[PDB]
Specification:
This is part of a larger assembly, with chains A (about 130 residues), B (about 120 residues), C (about 210 residues), D (about 110 residues) and E (about 55 residues). Chain B is about 0% helix and about 30% strand. Chain B is mostly beta strands and about 120 residues long. In chain C, the strands form 3 sheets. Chain C has an 8-stranded antiparallel sheet with strand order 8-11-12-2-1-13-9-10, with no helix packed on it. A 3-stranded antiparallel sheet of chain C has the order 3-4-7, with no helix packed on it. Chain C has a two-stranded antiparallel sheet with strand order 5-6. In chain C, a hairpin with a 4-residue loop joins β11 and β12. The longest helix of chain C has 9 residues. With about 110 residues, chain D is mainly β. Chain E has 1 helix and 4 strands. In chain E, β3 and β4 form a beta hairpin. Chain E is rod-shaped, with a radius of gyration of 22 Å. Classes of the chains: A alpha+beta (about 130), B mainly beta (about 120), C mainly beta (about 210), D mainly beta (about 110), E alpha+beta (about 55). The interface between C and D is medium-sized, with 17 and 15 residues. β5 of chain B pairs antiparallel with β4 of chain D, so a sheet runs across the interface. Chain C binds 4 RNA strands through β1, β2, α1 and β10. Chain A: One of its GO terms (molecular function) is structural constituent of ribosome. Chain A: One of its GO terms (biological process) is ribosomal large subunit assembly. Chain A: One of its GO terms (cellular component) is cytosolic large ribosomal subunit. Chain A: It comes from Escherichia coli (strain K12).
RNA sequence: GGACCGGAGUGGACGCAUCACUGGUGUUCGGGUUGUCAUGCCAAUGGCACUGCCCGGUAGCUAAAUGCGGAAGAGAUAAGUGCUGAAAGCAUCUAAGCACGAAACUUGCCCCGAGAUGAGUUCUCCCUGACCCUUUAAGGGUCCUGAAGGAACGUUGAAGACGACGACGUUGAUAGGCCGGGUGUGUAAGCGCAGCGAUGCGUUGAGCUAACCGGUACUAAUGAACCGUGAGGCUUAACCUU
RNA sequence: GAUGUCGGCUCAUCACAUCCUGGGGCUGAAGUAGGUCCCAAGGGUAUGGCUGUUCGCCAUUUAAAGUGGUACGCGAGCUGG
RNA sequence: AAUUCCUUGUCGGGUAAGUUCCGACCUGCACGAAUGGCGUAAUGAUGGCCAGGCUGUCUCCACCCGAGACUCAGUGAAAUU
RNA sequence: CACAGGUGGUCAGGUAGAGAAUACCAAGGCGCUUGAGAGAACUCGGGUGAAGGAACUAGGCAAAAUGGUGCCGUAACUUC
């Protein structure tokens, strides 16, 4: 069911959904490449890209607003000064997803998610 | 209104405070009613020195509702409570000589219109 | 003779000539073509086969594409067919956009409804609810009893129970025609129509008792 | 007309008066006095803003011979004639339907001038 | 509730008629590496959609 | 006191469809507000106390909302009404004959339905193979060589428990993001001015924004591979002067 | 070598020696009824008081407030009075 | 009447209507004074009745959310036959 | 049973409060060994239910509602 009500249930209330994707977003701006399950990667792109879109617009009010995603004092200095400005020539799509099938012998769908403009080093084998 | 056995305020000078409905009139196997319906009603909280007396049984029509009246154009006329006009049980027409507060287009129907000769609001 | 194919494209509420409100549904109707007309060996009378829409035709099969090439290279979307009698409808594109139902006062619109997941179940059957107090056990919307006794020893055939919706064809009949505009696909009908915005339908003349 | 937007834009008014919530207003409206049309007027405070397309409607609240009264009005309908602003009170919220229960800033106000 | 008579091995066999493993309709093949895989997924050699990816 | 067929308007009981209207609901939107913690602090913002609490609310769902359907006409027929008329030189609605006649029946209205294996019917599309052994309306082996279409996968849906069903995958606007619009909320933060200060005033009809909607290739939708091919058994009739 | 309740709730379904609705005969059928009575099973069918309650008595509304069958219709569905 | 048969006794009050309730009645169902009579305040996880507040218990069933339902990998029983 | 169970005695912090009540929170401890999806009706639990307001049900049971401090104010009846 749930027609024209887009979202992801899967587990506990919106407070847990926030705390999980805050941590996974913080990890993605920390490492610039992340391995995570496919339905979590497919939701992270809907909340991490509007943070980067806010980061294209530098102000005191916007940099206090980014504290709603990451409380870390260095990530708020990487946003607006590098993250955001480094995508200013692009029409969104600051991230990309790479689908890696199931976990071996199991059900769990696994993926990579990364920043599109980063320094390349992943051009080698998966195994 | 949607429920039966319910208290209504008076809108005319025949009595005081509240009166209780016992049935809606017209239609059968029925339960829903509005300002266009006649109801059967009992005297509960009115003074015995008025035009009414304790435990007497009348007819009435509803004239204000907290749900409101919508059909004149497609948008709501609303009121702060539920109130009615008291009528004779055998032959209808109002027993009151003076009405207070606003009224409706349905209050201008042949069986009720004798008390609105003073042309009140929303008639 | 034939119906006319359309789609529900919006719902609204507009003013009459005396200024009070009237509810309406906006229907897109698509211009009529005829693919062949069939011989008396089919149906029992003649039959008429029709198209209205078109598409990019990437996902259209050669079994369908050779037929739309026969029908004037129309790149058609959907295919419908009806009985033909008394009238002399053309064997090629007729280009009727709204004009079949411009002068007809009411129409018997056959809609397709909307998908609802579960709506073969419970809410479909208006079952009386079950109490959260007064002792009542393990029930809130369920039917309770579903049959008679050990004597018949069966639930009755066709009786109300659980099921998927998956959507289904429905005709409410005799909706009033408020407005039309030719070559601009407009049909406007009073009140509601089955399905959501984007749901397909066919329009018919008024044929109720 | 185009089946999208233009079909409903041809039924909208192009000179709607500039009232908003917390304005005390007079609303002129046709009452249909039997077999002929007649104009009437309603006066009270605006408790809801009007912006929702061709369906745009506002709500005004008052009293009538000791009874509490409210009217919803359709913006674009021909039955609603005109609106005049009497006073402008500051009420903050977009809709004040809780003012049917709360008396806070209901009959006492600071001039809004917006 | 419980059974009134135990079924034969035909019943367990007929309930199980509709289940099978690895119904992928053959593998995909990666023109860039010669590896085999499931469709629209990365190969073990990291090749996908014309380049090597997802290495750490 | 007091008429029927027919015509017109309308209420109740019942069902159906929708989310436009008027309400509800709206833990993923905006604002107000209590206790308390965090960020060095202030300012401010974020965590937590039922979604802390309160109010408005896009999208979606939905009646207490709104719209629609409730049997006409025709056919056959029961009770019955009726004509012609006999056994019974007459009579009689019945025997032969024969007219009229109900809400039940058939047709007419709604929906499923060719696995209807007793598988209707039309239209569009596609493929032209062979060697060897023997058992020969035949089977087996092996090699040359694949179409219509199907399947799988992706992006995923006003289709959905799974399956099934729909659109799009450069024959790209299918999803995310972006850009813009729009609904919703209600005049932010920073600064400056005013005040002892709570707090106000100005920039400011501000700031913020979701599910809707137009545009957009920024991001994501790979080469394939697989199944399926080789013009399709036997007989009688008709027709092709084969 | 199991019989776990009636009245009720939910969900119902069937019958006629037909409650109402369609047609028709008779009347002590003026009209309006009321009584009676034949054919007829497609659909429709209450609410509230006191009672564990069907039934009863009582009030109100309406078209009428009606009769019978179904492990006393239905707990591997609801109440446990 | 935790006593009363018959009985839903008879009358008053509340209510449109009260087998219940509360007051009054009985030429007294099988009432009767330490297996105590009558009666009063406060107390009761107290039996029955009533008014107000407020409420989805309901007329009538509507939305949102957690968990289970559902899919898949691992481990994989039972009452019963 | 590495069982949502039972088990005598003892000590204490910031904001807050009458407090060993109670919410947030410090120190310190817990993260409850099937794992990952799905986003179904339904069912249990939880929030909201327009209008009426116990009409429901054996019975407002349950739920909602009420809910504090200070001061003013306070009846029947009573053993005062």
């Amino acid at each position: 069911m749930r027609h024209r009500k887009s979202g992801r249930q899967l587990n506990r209330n919106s407070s847990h959904r926030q705390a999980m994707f805050r941590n996974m977003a913080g990890s993605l701006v920390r490492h610039e490449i992340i391995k995570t399950t496919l339905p979590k990667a497919k939701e992270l792109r809907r909340v991490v890209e509007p943070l980067i879109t806010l980061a294209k617009t530098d102000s005191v009010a916007n940099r206090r607003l980014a504290f709603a995603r990451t409380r870390d004092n260095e990530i708020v200095a990487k946003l607006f000064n590098e993250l955001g400005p480094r995508f200013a020539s692009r029409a969104g799509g600051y991230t990309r997803i790479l689908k890696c099938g199931f976990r071996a012998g199991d059900n769990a769908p696994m993926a990579y998610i990364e920043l599109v403009d980063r320094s390349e080093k992943a051009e080698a084998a998966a195994e | 209104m949607i429920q039966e056995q319910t208290m209504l305020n008076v809108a005319d000078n025949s009595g005081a405070r509240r009166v209780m409905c016992i049935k809606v009139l017209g239609g059968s196997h029925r339960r829903y009613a509005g300002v266009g319906d006649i109801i059967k009603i009992t005297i509960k909280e009115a003074i015995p020195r008025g035009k009414v007396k304790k435990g007497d049984v009348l007819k009435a029509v509803v004239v204000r509702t907290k749900k409101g009246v919508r059909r004149p154009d497609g948008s709501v006329i609303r009121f702060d409570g539920n109130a009615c006009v008291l009528l004779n049980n055998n032959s209808e027409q109002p027993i009151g000589t003076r009405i207070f507060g606003p009224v409706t287009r349905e209050l201008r129907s042949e069986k009720f219109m004798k008390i609105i000769s003073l042309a009140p609001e929303v008639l | 003779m034939i119906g006319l194919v359309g789609k529900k494209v919006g719902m609204t509420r507009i003013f009459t000539e005396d200024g009070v409100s009237i509810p309406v549904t906006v229907i897109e109707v698509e211009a009529n073509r005829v693919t062949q007309v069939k011989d008396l060996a089919n149906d029992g009378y003649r039959a008429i086969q029709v198209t209205t829409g078109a598409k990019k035709a990437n996902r259209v099969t050669k079994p369908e594409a050779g037929h739309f090439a026969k029908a004037g290279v129309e790149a058609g979307r959907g295919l419908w067919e009806f009985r033909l009698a008394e009238g002399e409808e053309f064997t090629v594109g007729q280009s009727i956009s709204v004009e079949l139902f411009a002068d007809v006062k009411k129409v018997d619109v056959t809609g397709t409804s909307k998908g609802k997941g579960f709506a073969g179940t419970v809410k479909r059957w208006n079952f009386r609810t079950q109490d959260a107090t007064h002792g009542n056990s393990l029930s809130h919307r369920v039917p309770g009893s579903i049959g008679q006794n050990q004597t018949p020893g069966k639930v009755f055939k066709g009786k109300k129970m659980a099921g998927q919706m998956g959507n289904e064809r429905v005709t409410v009949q005799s909706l009033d025609v408020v407005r039309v505009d030719a070559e601009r696909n407009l049909l406007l009908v009073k009140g509601a129509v089955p399905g959501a915005t984007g749901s397909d339908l066919i329009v018919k003349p008024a044929v109720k008792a | 007309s185009n089946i999208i937007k233009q079909l409903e834009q041809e039924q909208m008014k192009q000179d709607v008066p500039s009232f908003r919530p917390g304005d005390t207003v007079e609303v002129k409206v046709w009452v249909v006095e039997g077999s002929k049309k007649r104009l009437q007027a309603f006066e009270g405070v605006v408790i809801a803003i009007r912006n929702r397309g061709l369906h745009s409607a506002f709500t005004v609240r008052k009293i009538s011979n000791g009874e509490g009264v409210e009217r919803v009005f359709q913006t674009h309908s021909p039955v609603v004639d005109s609106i005049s602003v009497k006073r402008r009170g500051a009420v903050r919220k977009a809709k004040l339907y809780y003012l049917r229960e709360r008396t806070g800033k209901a009959a006492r106000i600071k001039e809004r001038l917006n | 509730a419980v059974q009134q008579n135990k079924p034969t091995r035909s019943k367990r066999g007929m309930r199980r008629s509709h289940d099978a493993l690895t119904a992928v309709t053959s593998l995909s093949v990666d023109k860039t590496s010669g590896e085999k895989h499931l469709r629209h997924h990365i190969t073990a050699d990291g090749y996908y959609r014309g380049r090597k990816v997802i290495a750490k």
